[PDB]
Amino acid sequence: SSYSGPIVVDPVTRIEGHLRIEVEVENGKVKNAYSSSTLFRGLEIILKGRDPRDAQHFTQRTCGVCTYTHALASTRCVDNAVGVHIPKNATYIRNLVLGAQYLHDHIVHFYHLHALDFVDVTAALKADPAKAAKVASSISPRKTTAADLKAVQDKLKTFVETGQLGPFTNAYFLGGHPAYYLDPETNLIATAHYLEALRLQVKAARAMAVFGAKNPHTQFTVVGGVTCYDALTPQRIAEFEALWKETKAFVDEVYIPDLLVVAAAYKDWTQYGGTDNFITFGEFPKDEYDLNSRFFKPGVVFKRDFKNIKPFDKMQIEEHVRHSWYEGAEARHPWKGQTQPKYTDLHGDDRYSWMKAPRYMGEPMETGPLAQVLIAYSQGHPKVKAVTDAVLAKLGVGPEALFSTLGRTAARGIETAVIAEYVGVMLQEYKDNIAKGDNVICAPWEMPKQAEGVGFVNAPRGGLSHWIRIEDGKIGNFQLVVPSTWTLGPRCDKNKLSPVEASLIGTPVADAKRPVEILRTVHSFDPCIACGVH
Amino acid sequence: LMGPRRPSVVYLHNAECTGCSESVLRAFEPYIDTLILDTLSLDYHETIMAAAGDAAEAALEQAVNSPHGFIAVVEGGIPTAANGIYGKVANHTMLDICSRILPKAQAVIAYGTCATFGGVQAAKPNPTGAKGVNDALKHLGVKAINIAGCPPNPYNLVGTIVYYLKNKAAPELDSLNRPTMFFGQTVHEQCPRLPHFDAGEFAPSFESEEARKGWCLYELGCKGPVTMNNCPKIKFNQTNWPVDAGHPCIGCSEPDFWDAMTPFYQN
Ligand code: SF4
Ligand code: SF4
Ligand code: F3S
Ligand SMILES: [Mg+2]
């Protein structure tokens, strides 16, 4: 009782944007995969000829999930082009807002995008809330009572008995599903925390608005620094700090223990969705012109050879179009990029996506939390090592376990925990700098008529780069190369499967009508298709 | 997904960045859990719904054809160039999807400047021929309530929905089909820096002592004077808004703003 034939998942839900996944299944396992991105907007085309100062406002709208990240990348890119060295406080404030973005983003991803692949919300109604409370209190320093969880169960019961299941309508778990493993009590704990996370994320996002004006789509960055003089005040710093502290507590006491209880129940998921190659750009600089000054450092690894981390050479990036809906077949370095749409329909002329296919030294590279964590680990990062080792020991698995869908999901949690703590360190450094009498947040600069620039962000989904060629003081070319482009773009002109495609090979599918296993792997990369395609 | 009891909402995503969906998640008093468990029945939403693929498509059909009726909330512009092919879901163009579903709704709300007016992908040279919902579907008689902004204040969405549920009608709308209860004032007339404007006290640069002191941002491009929104009043995330963060308004609740308000740092 194992299926052979195609499976199409279109739309892939619980991602940002518009993705179609196609697989071929042979005897109950995936033997082939295509990652098809089915919306194009063309922001790179739109930017041509405009004022480089305007780029961040357009490119931020690449994505509202990874809001701020593109404004930061564009501003880093134009800062770089004009050769301005922004003040220490602008680096601190930009870094603090970015750290808060990671916490918001990863919490929402685990609960609101990923968890319904693993949690049967309706089985929570059959749970014993007293047994569930004991379990919940054993995994966290946060003590949970039976009444606590019964309140959630009562609310859910009412919701389900209305027959209006809303976002749970036709869920793959309804009626039971052989790939869903959790007991009723663990479902109830995860469902309770899903709901809690809906309100906690409000606070995590608010933390960005304290300095950054608003979320979504911050409005405090300028070429040369930041604009928010109010962010210097003790009141705004206190407000930020309080939100950060509450968000970190949720990470530490709710998200990571839930991640570990679910990972332990799905330990077979160490055996699927591995990848070979990894790229990461580093994040949280001390020096805006030196990636190696970042708390997380850049690096490149091929074929899981973490003993031999290679330096990141930005000139070795090329974006392929042979299997994409663009003209021709020529890959381009983004300073020579081209965005020339030409649609051929699904698999017309062997083309099946609006994403380009970035390759590093010709190889397909996973980026994102697993890349950032594994490379930092391998560079001796003490905080990443400490958290990763504790996660490994708690799960009773060795490091090989990380090269998988479960691995990736765990790495997202690891990075969340590490960044939540590091925000506190950055905050203190910021405070210290203010206390020294440094109240400067923006530096003057001048627009060159001709220049090239690049800005690098390690965003929640991985290495983000924005590339500008300034001509006559205007945008001659502006190219975005985005983490989901790397991870979920299609094949290249050497026909190498992208990370998502390759990772899907070997996926078991118990029920082809309800292919939750495909979703588990795809969701573990946290796809953002507006990002990937722009 | 729905039946009696709570009003059904079908939420569609066209050419968008999901920032408008994220804004709804920031809902405050009521919060988003109250809205989806008590107020409304969120019967289709690609970002957060459990079902995918064929099951997701069946959920949408079930919702749209319910005899109980549904409200449509639409995020993103509709790409119309090349017969709609720049945007597809379930291998149907967004144009075709919206053309079929929206005339069936009891009410349509276009949420965000992309859905209202075309937005960022509609900016010159508009390679995908992206249109706002009412522009794209005027021939089918669709007249969506337009809640503009990039993204809008989610206060404005919830407020519109609640009004509609209570009064069984749209609130008073302006000439861009936006509720006058939210969009009836310029940003500028509500701005705390207005006395500086009146006095001709403008920051000449972001690094300047005048900017530090909170002087008016008009010389640095502020489009508050020509932008209708409730930003200074409601603020965002219960705590801030662009000019109080020291940055000019970029005019994000106005039609064609990407081209009309640019260069953003000039007036
Ligand atoms: S209106 Fe703005 S925030 Fe909303 S979908 Fe469009 S680009 Fe994104
Ligand atoms: S900062 Fe902008 S909205 Fe405020 S007074 Fe000046 S021009 Fe008006
Ligand atoms: S940029 Fe938009 S969010 Fe308000 S302050 Fe201006 S209308
Ligand atoms: Mg690009």
Short mmCIF file of N, CA and C and ligand atoms in Angstrom, two decimals, chain A residues 44 319 356 479-481 534, ligand 4:
data_model
loop_
_atom_site.label_atom_id
_atom_site.label_comp_id
_atom_site.label_asym_id
_atom_site.label_seq_id
_atom_site.Cartn_x
_atom_site.Cartn_y
_atom_site.Cartn_z
N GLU A 44 13.19 44.54 -9.57
CA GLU A 44 14.47 44.96 -10.13
C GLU A 44 14.27 45.81 -11.39
N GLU A 319 23.70 33.76 -10.96
CA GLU A 319 22.28 33.35 -10.97
C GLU A 319 21.91 32.84 -12.37
N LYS A 356 15.21 32.71 -10.17
CA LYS A 356 16.52 32.37 -10.73
C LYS A 356 17.13 31.28 -9.86
N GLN A 479 20.07 44.49 -8.26
CA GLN A 479 19.76 43.08 -8.25
C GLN A 479 19.67 42.57 -6.82
N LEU A 480 18.58 41.84 -6.58
CA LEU A 480 18.41 41.16 -5.31
C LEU A 480 18.72 39.68 -5.50
N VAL A 481 19.48 39.08 -4.59
CA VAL A 481 19.74 37.67 -4.56
C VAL A 481 19.35 37.26 -3.12
N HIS A 534 10.88 38.24 -6.15
CA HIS A 534 10.84 39.71 -6.20
C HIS A 534 10.43 40.22 -7.61
MG MG C 4 17.06 38.88 -8.16
#
